[PDB]
Symmetry: D2
Subunit: 312 residues, 4 copies
């Protein structure tokens, strides 16, 4: 039976401790020897750079001591942690994240079977070399494309652009897809000796949008700003003016979109080369922030950041 | 044949690039007469009159174009059988909900745009405009509130949103679904929005020169409170939170909006999550902080209702009631 | 607290396997009392009374269980405040539309099932049944026709379908969207089906012992006409075509149904395609062949309406009118 | 510039001849030298075994004479032809199928840009070794998972279980996925010397379903029957009884589902081993018929057919 390490971080799936979660699912003994460690116990709405750095280093350090990792986490920023670990984890043994939309005490609580299926996924050797995974609602989702689509639905987690890697049925996964984008040990991002990440903020676009958010970030000397643009990454004129300034003043600017699916493209309405802006592609704002932080540990050059956004 | 007025505001439906193949284009560069003349079959279904209100990308849409549109429809109601509004896709869902809450004309108001420019191969704008006129000319379209017609579908202004950056099929009513489908110039309506719209709302913009100041802040891991603080320091009437999950806030953002709400800033919890209600009775004690829960209203759509709510009241209980009825 | 009757028919909500982990299970093996007793919180929202009508997998649902359900609801209407019907997922969308067209009780009728057996880890059935009772007990649920409540969502019997073989979230109203969403025991209704249902339909099954014979044939490349010929040779009252695309037929299948329609078999074009109307004024001259276009009705749902239509009339024009109103 | 062969078969994208279709899109000269051949001019509702056999042999024979193939086809059975060619084509040069929901003469006709994007896809060398493709609505879809989801929508074609391979924007594709299931030259199906396929029929399940369709197929001595089951591939009792008989009497039986997404699984309500039935997995009825016909050119053994349904 596989040795599987659960790293617990909190979320609705749990204040409840790592060992209690395991004990609630005695069928885990059927498929793995599971050891639990508490990393934090926080709502993922309070997830932060320090936790991300902790997790990346803990998995990188303990890779050779276990066969697989399950990370119990909140739903709210699961998609941000998953893509951060996707880009920084050098362990090519399965790393699976799981949470729950309903608490332990709720009718038809989703947590137990979710944890079960996450351990099935971490225990499957076919799961190796697919990068960091999210397993929710009997589905195996790659850390780059996966996102929460509904505020309360148990089926919230979907890979809305490129689809899932595999479905789980009766403790077995039929894997039919693997992410082409470079992940884990195929990325140059090395966080082993970092204690902080570049400061990257996100501003929202809408009708009559204020430039004051964008100006507060520039005024604070932020390393990068992601735009949650309208439609194909477009910018209200005030926000465009403040970000045009930012980009030629030592702030990297990424155009993403508030629109829940599809790429922010080059060659549409915005001359990215003229402004020194970067097109996020299918990365939504919060994912674009992840990659922009990491790109900025290697470069400040807008053209080299665009190459990163085309590769990872 | 019914009298239909097109009020043009620009958008990619009125855009052009130098190639029919290349994705490059500039917006709001073609007049309404040009859009009308690219749909020769329009004569078969309506007496079309075009007026050019503005010629902008909807990325530059603003309060003043909203007040101008609402006042014009309300003023001209008795002069026409229906309105079509040519507009950009990017903020269509915002304009549509604004007009849905402020127009008192109960004759069909239909918005329409296009994802491909007028210059491109298989341009979507011509059939979209044909289908928007069909809808505007349909007696059954009346008393449904303000509509968006895109990709053979009639959507209500409240739930309608753009779901994809490039796809001609992008416009969907992601929570409650479309009102009807258009085939061969006919509509089978099976739904009407229950939320109050148009002549059933108390919002009157006929005398208004401006709208209350409402901003949107994004939540994410390690979110800066600096955007929230910038809006509070400029004395904003309202802030909408694009929350994570069921409208949750990073602790820094939480503390700044809690403080803001105690000095009388209106604060609405919405969600960055593309579908589902931001509910009461979740992780946030709204009554305790004087916050308002957006329901199915996404952050940009919650702004619209919060701006109009702040023209009646600054009370968080009464703003909650408004978010439960409109 | 309102009086709610559960009429149990079996389904996976009443299923069990020897493992909480393994996918193996057998259906309709648990009584209603057992389902009631696994939802202790039901006492908080209703006075629940269970009656076991049948105990079957919905894969074995049939005309006689449909007549038994409709007659029982109609008979007992005055004895209760609402009905919940525990049923399998597989044919729920068929039963739901049958009852939507035949029940004259305008008190909430709510159907509910589960994708995981009662024995499985994170079983969906207990919260599903809680949420089906909430809906049945909600005064606002009345006059909406027959409902399906699954995964925190209230769906109308006409548009509701199962979209996934295993997913707890499978039930969706794929053309016109849900009626409301349930959070913390409360419902925000924003839609009601416009098609006529319940006390607005002319269909009366109170005296009926049987339903007219209606079969379904599948279209595909190189489709055999043998299924179609088998139904015609047994003198079927109606055939529904699961067409390709916009309800198109392979030429062999076409020729057999054309022939059948000229001897008085009712023939409805539906589509194997999971969303969208099978329209008139496409590739098939329906008036020429005496065919009927199903609209948004999928083949199994078109059967339901064709069976009930054939109890009033065998005329293709009047069956077309029925498919345009119900 | 790539040499690209268009094989025309009909559909709404066209009675209009192969050369007229090309001439309507003069921008094709920008991206390929395109030669057109008329194979048939039929509505794809009348697609048939003979056409499938023609196409497979024509592409296999002409592989070395061109850089890429585009097949113009009706929407209605596009998903059946695509999966047939996916399994029988030995050319690992791009094979792209395209159609249109609207005719040439319609307002905002989709055909022109659809054909353009199909040639972009056939001309891209990154398209090679992904198996037979469908390009519709700016999307590249694998021939196995792709299906029509709406009767009239231009965006009808989707890979509803595993998602698309790539999006097309400005004549370029960002490919992020490839089908894992074995296709083209990785399959043993060889149709080069076949003039007919095994007779496989499809029967529909619903409440009070007649056994008469299933009995007519058995009575005709059909080689196989696919069940479009209810839910997870289940069978109305009458249909189950007639198919239990078929399976032990020289008819292969495949359990598929009328439900538009998800696998028909083993280990649910049906003892497949006891009945000698095969579970289709994510193959819908009409796709299951494709693979069942081809499996039956190699074997009649239910256990060997199940292995085929687990591999292709
Ligand atoms: N269901 C959840 O996990 C929500 C919670 N606020 C979290 O993300 O931690
Ligand atoms: N397709 C479009 O219309 C996009 C454009 N930027 C607009 O919103 O005006
Ligand atoms: N989940 C389910 O209920 C499936 C079952 N075969 C039924 O329809 O009775
Ligand atoms: N749009 C289409 O192609 C439909 C047509 N009946 C076909 O498949 O040939």
């Amino acid at each position: 039976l596989p040795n599987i390490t659960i790293l617990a971080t909190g979320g609705t799936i749990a204040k409840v401790g790592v060992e209690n979660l395991v004990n609630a699912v005695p069928q885990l003994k059927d498929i793995a020897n599971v050891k639990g460690e508490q990393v934090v116990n926080i709502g993922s709405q309070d997830m932060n750079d320090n936790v991300w750095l902790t997790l990346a280093k803990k998995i990188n350090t303990d890779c050779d001591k276990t066969d697989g990792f399950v990370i119990t986490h909140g739903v709210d920023t699961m998609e941000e942690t998953a893509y951060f670990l996707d880009l920084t984890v050098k362990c090519d043994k399965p790393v699976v994240m799981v949470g729950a939309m309903r608490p332990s005490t709720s009718m038809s609580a989703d947590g137990p079977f979710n944890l079960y299926n996450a351990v099935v996924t971490a225990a499957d050797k076919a799961s190796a070399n697919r990068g960091v995974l999210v397993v929710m609602n009997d589905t195996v989702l790659d850390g780059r494309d996966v996102t929460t689509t509904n505020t309360t639905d148990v089926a919230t987690f979907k890979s809305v652009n490129y689809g899932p890697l595999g479905y789980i049925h009766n403790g077995k996964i039929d894997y039919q897809r693997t992410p082409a984008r470079k992940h884990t040990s195929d990325t140059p991002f090395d966080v082993s000796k970092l204690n902080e990440l570049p400061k990257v903020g996100i501003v929202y676009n809408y009708a009559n949008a204020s430039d004051l958010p964008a100006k507060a970030l520039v005024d604070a000397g932020y390393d990068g700003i992601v735009s949650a643009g309208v439609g194909n990454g477009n910018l209200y004129k005030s926000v465009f003016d403040t970000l045009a300034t930012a980009a030629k003043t030592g702030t990297a600017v990424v155009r993403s979109s508030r629109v829940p699916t599809g790429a922010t493209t080059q060659d549409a309405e915005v001359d990215d080369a003229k402004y020194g802006f970067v097109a996020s592609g299918t990365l939504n704002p919060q994912k674009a922030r992840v990659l922009l932080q990491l790109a900025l540990t290697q470069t400040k050059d807008p053209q080299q950041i665009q190459q990163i956004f085309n590769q990872y």
